[PDB]
Design a protein around this nucleic acid. Structure first.
Length: 95
RNA sequence: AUUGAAAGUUCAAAGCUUAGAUACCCUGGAGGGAAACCAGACUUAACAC
């Protein structure tokens, strides 16, 4: 099929989370959480990918190439990333 | 009365074919919900003398 593996996961906030969208003019708060098209909080796949990729590059120093092969090259990308992240959808929020 | 006179560079003809604005890229870093502030002020009235 198109994807070799498809591994969904859940994202559980251990501490509080701030993933920002950066100070719009129509907002009221000046550092709001990333919303989505419907208005629910979300984590854009770009934020997810950058955070996870930096973490992995520092926590698996012997597998950078593997990581680089799957998540993309930082410098001079001769090819696309094999791996894809979807925008993290809000599953359940404490109220 | 001229090495002259006369004679349409004309006709037919698709700038088309194949081709992903894609690849890599964390709204992050820095920043004390603080600063000021008395739970206080005062007895008065009545009649008796």
């Amino acid at each position: 099929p198109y994807y070799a593996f498809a591994e969904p996961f859940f994202i559980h906030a251990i501490t509080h989370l701030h993933v920002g969208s950066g100070s719009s003019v129509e907002e009221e708060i000046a550092l709001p959480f990333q919303r989505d098209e419907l208005g629910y909080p979300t984590i854009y796949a770009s934020s997810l990918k950058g955070a996870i990729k930096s973490f992995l590059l520092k926590e698996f120093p012997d597998k950078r190439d593997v990581i680089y092969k799957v998540l993309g090259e930082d410098e001079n990308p001769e090819e696309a990333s094999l791996g894809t992240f979807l925008d993290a959808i809000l599953f359940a929020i404490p109220s």
